[PDB]
């Protein structure tokens, strides 16, 4: 029974590494787009009947500038944010993120330990 469970787990569908190109970094002060994409599209499952997706996005924030995404719950704002980190399956388009990244989710993730440690 346990081998069956473990095999199902090990075979569960992973995140596709090439959804976003995190490698690049730009040696300019504030003069480069951080995201790049023409008609980028992302999906939450590779299994059919996609309950959630992003379609034909060409979002473009710039180095050193604050940018915001506007939309009510379910409009795709969380999806776009998380796809910027590589957490969604790029079905069509292109995507990239430059330099080192960081992220804060809607729900604050906190780890048992010192506040200095968190």
């Amino acid at each position: 029974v346990s081998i069956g469970r473990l095999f199902t787990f090990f075979t569960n569908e992973e995140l596709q590494p090439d959804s976003v190109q995190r490698l690049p970094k730009v040696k300019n002060i504030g003069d480069v787009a951080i995201n790049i994409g023409d008609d980028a599209t992302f999906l939450w499952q590779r299994k059919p009947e996609y309950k959630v997706a992003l379609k034909n996005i060409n979002f473009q924030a710039k180095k050193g500038n604050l940018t915001c995404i506007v939309g009510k719950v379910g409009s795709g704002k969380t999806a776009l944010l998380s796809c910027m980190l590589g957490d969604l399956f790029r079905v069509k388009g292109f995507a990239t993120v430059h330099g080192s990244v960081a992220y804060v989710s809607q729900v604050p993730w906190i780890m048992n330990g010192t506040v200095k440690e968190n």
Binding site: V52, A53, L54, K55, N56, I57, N58, F59, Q60, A61, K62, N65, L66, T67, C68, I69, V70, G71, G74, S75, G76, K77, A79, L80
Partner: peptide, 11 residues
């Protein structure tokens, strides 16, 4: 410094 409007998965 910039803004984007999201509509049901599109922009």
């Amino acid at each position: 410094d910039s803004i984007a409007l999201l509509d049901n998965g599109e922009i």
